[PDB]
Symmetry: D3
Subunit: 321 residues, 6 copies
Amino acid sequence: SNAMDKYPFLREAGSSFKDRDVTKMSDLIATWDGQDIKGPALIGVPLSKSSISHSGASFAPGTIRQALKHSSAYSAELGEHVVSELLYDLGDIDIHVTDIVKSHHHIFQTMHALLSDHPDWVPLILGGDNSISYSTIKAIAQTKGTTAVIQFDAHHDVRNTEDGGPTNGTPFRRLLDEEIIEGQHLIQLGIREFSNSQAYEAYAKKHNVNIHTMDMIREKGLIPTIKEILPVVQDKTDFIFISVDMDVLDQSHAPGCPAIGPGGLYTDELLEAVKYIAQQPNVAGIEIVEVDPTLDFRDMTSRAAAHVLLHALKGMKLSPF
Amino acid sequence: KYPFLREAGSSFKDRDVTKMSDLIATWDGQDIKGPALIGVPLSKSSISHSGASFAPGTIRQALKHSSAYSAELGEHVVSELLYDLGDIDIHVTDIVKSHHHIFQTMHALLSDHPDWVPLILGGDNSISYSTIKAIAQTKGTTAVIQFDAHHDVRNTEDGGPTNGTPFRRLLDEEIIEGQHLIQLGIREFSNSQAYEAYAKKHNVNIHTMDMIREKGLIPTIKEILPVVQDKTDFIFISVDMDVLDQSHAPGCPAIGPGGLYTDELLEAVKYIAQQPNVAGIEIVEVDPTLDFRDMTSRAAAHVLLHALKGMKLSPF
Amino acid sequence: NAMDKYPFLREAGSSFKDRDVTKMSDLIATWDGQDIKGPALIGVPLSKSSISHSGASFAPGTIRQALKHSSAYSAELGEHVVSELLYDLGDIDIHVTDIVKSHHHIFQTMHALLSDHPDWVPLILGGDNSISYSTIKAIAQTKGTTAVIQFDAHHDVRNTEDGTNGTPFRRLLDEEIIEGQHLIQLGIREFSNSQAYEAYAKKHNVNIHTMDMIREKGLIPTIKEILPVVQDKTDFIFISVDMDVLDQSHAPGCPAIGPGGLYTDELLEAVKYIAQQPNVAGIEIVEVDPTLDFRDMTSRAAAHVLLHALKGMKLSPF
Amino acid sequence: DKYPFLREAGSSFKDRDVTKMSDLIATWDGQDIKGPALIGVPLSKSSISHSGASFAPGTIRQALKHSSAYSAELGEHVVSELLYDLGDIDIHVTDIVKSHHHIFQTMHALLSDHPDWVPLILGGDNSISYSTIKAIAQTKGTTAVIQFDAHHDVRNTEDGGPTNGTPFRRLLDEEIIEGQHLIQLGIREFSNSQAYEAYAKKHNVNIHTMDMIREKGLIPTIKEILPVVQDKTDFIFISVDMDVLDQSHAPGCPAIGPGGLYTDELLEAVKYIAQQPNVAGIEIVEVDPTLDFRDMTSRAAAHVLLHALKGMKLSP
Amino acid sequence: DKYPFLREAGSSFKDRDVTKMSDLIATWDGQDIKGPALIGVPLSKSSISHSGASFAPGTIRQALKHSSAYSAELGEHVVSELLYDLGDIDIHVTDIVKSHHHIFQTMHALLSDHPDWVPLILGGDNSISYSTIKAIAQTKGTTAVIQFDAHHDVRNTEDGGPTNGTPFRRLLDEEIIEGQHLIQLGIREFSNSQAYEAYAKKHNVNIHTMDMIREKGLIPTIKEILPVVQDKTDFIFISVDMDVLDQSHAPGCPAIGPGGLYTDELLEAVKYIAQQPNVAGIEIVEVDPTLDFRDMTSRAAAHVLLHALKGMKLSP
Amino acid sequence: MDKYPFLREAGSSFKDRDVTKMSDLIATWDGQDIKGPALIGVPLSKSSISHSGASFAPGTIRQALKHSSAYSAELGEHVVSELLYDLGDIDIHVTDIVKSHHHIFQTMHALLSDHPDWVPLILGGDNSISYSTIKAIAQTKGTTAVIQFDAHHDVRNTEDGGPTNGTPFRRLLDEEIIEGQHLIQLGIREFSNSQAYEAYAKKHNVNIHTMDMIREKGLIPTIKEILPVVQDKTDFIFISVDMDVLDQSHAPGCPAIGPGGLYTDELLEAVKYIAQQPNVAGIEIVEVDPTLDFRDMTSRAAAHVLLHALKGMKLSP
Ligand SMILES: C[As](C)(=O)[O-]
Ligand SMILES: C[As](C)(=O)[O-]
Ligand SMILES: [Ca+2]
Ligand SMILES: [Ca+2]
Ligand SMILES: [Ca+2]
Ligand SMILES: [Ca+2]
Ligand SMILES: [Ca+2]
Ligand SMILES: [Ca+2]
Ligand SMILES: [Ca+2]
Ligand SMILES: [Ca+2]
Ligand SMILES: [Ca+2]
Ligand SMILES: [Ca+2]
Ligand SMILES: [Ca+2]
Ligand SMILES: [Ca+2]
Ligand SMILES: [Cl-]
Ligand SMILES: [Cl-]
Ligand SMILES: [Cl-]
Ligand SMILES: [Cl-]
Ligand SMILES: [Cl-]
Ligand SMILES: [Cl-]
Ligand SMILES: [Cl-]
Ligand SMILES: [Cl-]
Ligand SMILES: [Cl-]
């Protein structure tokens, strides 16, 4: 290591501009060796073959990591970095090339073992398509306890399971039907006009899901909408899990989601909401789904996703709990 | 029985989903009651090199993949079915021919089927001359609500019947009156002094982005529409997609900063489409060859969905 | 004929009609169960089976469109390459999520069609490589001892378990549906393969012809020399065209691109030449991915593969 | 200037030891034109398929200008004096029939006023060939046309008007040129219609397919047919339609497919022909920059002109 | 004339009733500069990120030229007589330091020989701001700077030389301007470093974050800090780094992210500031046309220029 | 860590036990002693006359190489048997081109000196790097013949734009770092060059073979006749591959694309033949620009150029 250091101008492959006065996430993220996980740590779930649509979401964990590593870790509103020590990257959950059901078991088992072995781990999950939310939440629910889910989404995601299988749109029907979480502990934020079916809306109502449309959010405001509903739900639950489906964002702000359309959230609105929720007690995890780098302009949507990570971390650093 | 053999190109079907594709039928000559689609694939009329002739296909595709279900209404925006009447035959070479095809086809259909409410898919802005002429001349005295960053009153000497000229022709030819023309979204730096002069000189109701941003789009509409509404028999909605901010409609030939945002436009269209005697709506200046993915075609599909929503709402 | 009164109103999306032109679109008919004589298109939009990300499930759509837009007229023939009509049977339903199921559907469907329509010569539009196992098994078990001509840079004999895009010919050989000595691999490319898989191939006595041999002997010369010998030992031949046999410059839309492949005119000629031979039971085209393509170049290449297949068939002295 | 570091907007790296075509090309000032001179014909609405070939004169100029003028083979510049750029022909945005007269009138007067001008014509779609060839024929005399092309281009005129597919039917039917004086190089399998092929044979057109060419070599087939046609004509005109090239070599043509010419083949052929007595002009058609990869096809077209200039320099 | 349908290479549709910037802008002759004039600075090798900002002066020019000169809200054109285009500053292919010297020397001389010249500067990356501002300050007087930016741009100069992230360190360290005359609008959460924010604070820079701006408003925020700084200075100079805009509004900047200004906000603010007395100039940096969608960001930049032109015209 | 059987390291695709990719063979250099070929990137492109992203090519080429089989069927063995060290990238200054060149020369000179058995596999970077790379070779190893595959002479004067990608063989020749007659230029292309530079090169007696000559005689025979003559006046050979030597259809990601170039087929075969010769001191690949490419076609061709080079070395006495 001094054999190589005698070459002052020789650096490892892929190095970028180094500024000694800068601290970027890349300076704070370490590959995880077995060591004890305290707090937030990243994990990738590159599953996208379950998608109804043709999807490149299996590439998102790579591109979101890249956007994240290239961001400054410094918050001017905190007067400090959002990671105090270091942030582990646990790796990627192995995904079966072929069998989607096998892939889901990989996810549930790894997540379960991980949560149990390291009870202080708060997952930062990089999807992957929407279907992963079944396995991740089930692991939270069956390792942590009664869990509330805050689902940012244009869609209910309660699709019937027999037509496609564990498809993109089925995670929450699977969760509700199997009683992994309760309908009234589910807060859906951003449900969008013309993004849903009559039947599926009915199915979420039967189950007492808390539905907040874009229409409601626009008149009442996102943060006030959450203050109005979150307290009630927290009172019936032990933990909260934040599921961010990036297609809740307006197509102009997230062109890289498979299901794009007008009438959605703007990113700064989302970032603020995530930071708010992240400060609340017993936040068990956050996942980001439905980013598709092959559909993106440059990597705008992966950058937007990375900022969701930064603002969640910010919220956690800020929380009293 | 070839249970696993399927029609070419067919995809995921879901019993619990009702998409527009489930409700749109190829027209077979049956009587037309209410909204029906018609394509107008003309774009050589354009001053700018334009692929707007492909818009009818892309907008159809985006519309067909959308849910027909409205949550605000608790019902689908189309009760029974929605005929797609086809495309107007556009000549390869002669643009004046193409305008005759449009007017004469529109005229015969409005005539044969007095309950047809046209949902017109352009095509570039030049088509408005012939679509509105057919409306005025079959339905009577007509008010036009023109969402546009531009006046569209260019001269005809320099380039023939270009996409820039349709409202000059319409005004000069007294087929509509200026005072029944409502222009929403007229944008600073998008227009010409002499052309604005022409519009004022005809008493066009001009509402700029400045006024809309101050007053708000619907309130701006609620102030002038009632007026024009009571001195006309019918209203027609001309939506030029370049009224939208470039960030929201990246696929229009004439993009720039400082336009309407989509949810804003969508609300305004539903509000107008609720009014009595809406004779039709057309969508122009979508160019899928300039678009990102099909963002701007999806925005146009949603303009239609919201128009349909407003029409479903009207009886109440 | 109620629309005739609207002389300028046409069907949605119908374009420039030229009266003196006959395109494939004019001759391809949506199939409605009628008895099938000769060539008929069928789509197999499976691409999830791909090791790498693949929009191959879209190729049947884009190859269809490129075919339809091509003229049906061959000047070397002085006639259209199809006379009456060419049925399009449709697409094999593939499960969105279950891939074993999808391969069972493909086999079941192909088998039922080949049984019920003995004069059907399948023009199969993939879809990725893995469909070859299901399509060829149907052929061998319904038509009989079958020789395979696979154009390909890769042996496609990858392990079936440990990690299935590059497995079809291992499954094929292992289950003895086909004999290695009846397998002719054309275009196998330097640095596209693994010692183990080549050994597996040489172990089953497959006829391997590398790009080096083909560039030395010439492609047609190579074929004339090996093909008749294999026909002597078999009852049918099946043409499997993996488009990645083509140089990246000629087929940019294949997942596995690299330099040193065949050129498209060189492959078209060879396909025409094979398609005149006795008892051609079918042809398939795999590994076209419209999402990786420039414009639709590779779909156009594939569509021309079909045209030259049809052309050879109409030329066949049998 | 008194500002050593101030240059004209958009200046490029200047290398004193290098001479690019940009250093030799000069906008026409009205002087007498002796030898080759560029003229642009930015017309593409006449195209059957949607086409941006009207941008090609610009993109081809740009690629030509950025090239070296020096031929290592000649040991001199393919033009060491100057090469005028006559400008562009005015294209009506709407009326293509009118646009064709513009082209014919302009070429005819330029040709009549400057008998030593050899046009280097930059299209534009293949439809300009009627008007350019008519001007050469009715100005120079009996003209052989060497038409590099995948297609016969003898489409009937009724369907689309004078589209880019009709030019040689118009020429032959109106007796502007004789069939036996038309040499078609590169006619490609599956690119043509029965009726159109038969039309060509009826007029005794000299048809050389890609198959014949791949069997004999392009130059040998040229050495075999050319002397016959020269024996019965006074002038040669070269019409290069870039879709004669394989799609992998000319991605930017509207009609691409496999099995065409390779660019080096074409370049050698064009230089060989340009060496002959009485080459009256060359045109390049069907370059579409909006469909190209980078500007490959416009670069290929720029080299076609460079190799023509080279051959004209080489002629005894 | 003699050839009626022959026009200059590349000429566009001319319309007689429309005055676009391209009719007003004139390639500079050397005559005395009265008022605003354009000058290009095609430098981007000084950027940390791989950047094509050297193409922006051309793309922004192109966008500007195709824009209407007519301001509806003004009832007149923002330019009255003509607007000179001074040309481009010579940028060395290889030596980034030499390029900065060229910029300062050229700029210094022009502002000395033409005391009435108001620079409309088209970059180029942010690194130019040192040479441009220093030139204003050392030729004009005590200078106030309004920096629209998501970043402080006070990076240390040791790690990479005079890169695009350093200009305000160089400016402050050398006391070319005082920190308390530096107004930073749009400083963005997560776009900056602790040590760099401290350097800015140590120097008493006026820092306004996106957060603060979102609370008070952009125009209010300005009306409140500007008067104070104008007391202490003789001129204000406007530095617009386009990456101050949200990524959805300016996709063509190297450093894109969410949470930025919207183009309409920015345009209003530029207009406001440009009304003030003693505006010595404006520069636009960090537009990268090779990263853009179409030329949206170049159009956005063209429009900034128009709202500043508009602003200057409406003050005595 | 093995505790979680379905957890793997970030970015891990699936591995086939029976496949051997260059990825299974390439290791980050820990300082150990270099025996044979080793990779090294030179991410420099600001020195390019045209706007150039060739600074990204070391990454994209490395990715393409790593994903390629190492197995040569024609050889019946892998082209690497041991391992292949990736030394890393030489640090390129964001701003100072001349300092960056010094960095390259000095890292290069230092490395070749401390590891006598290193055969550099260099990844450009634009062509301006050749000056510092070849100088390091010449002054570290001895008299060197240079075979440059190139459409252009690259003898541009240095005064107009400084040490650009156009100037490396001017600098090399002017400073008598090599002799003209030791430079073999393969692929020099019609209309790609200027009268004055062709003259410079001829004045220096450089061996010039145009595409025309090559198309007439064949690339390999052309080489077979001039190469021994130069090996005769030379102790080592260095292979300089500028990829714009390739036809645009085959290498669309090179800043300078035009028709009438070499095809990758011929180039591959030529590099392998040359790399078979005694005393091949190294190879560099320059002028691939990933930002201009279609997919990564041109980086893939570069990766194959490297594969065939190793194959030649593997195959040499
Ligand atoms: C086309 As966009 C930058 O508004 O997503
Ligand atoms: C798709 As190509 C122009 O590289 O052959
Ligand atoms: Ca969703
Ligand atoms: Ca969802
Ligand atoms: Ca308009
Ligand atoms: Ca408009
Ligand atoms: Ca293969
Ligand atoms: Ca294969
Ligand atoms: Ca033609
Ligand atoms: Ca043609
Ligand atoms: Ca900035
Ligand atoms: Ca900045
Ligand atoms: Ca070169
Ligand atoms: Ca070179
Ligand atoms: Cl979803
Ligand atoms: Cl318009
Ligand atoms: Cl894909
Ligand atoms: Cl494969
Ligand atoms: Cl287009
Ligand atoms: Cl044609
Ligand atoms: Cl910056
Ligand atoms: Cl770049
Ligand atoms: Cl070079």
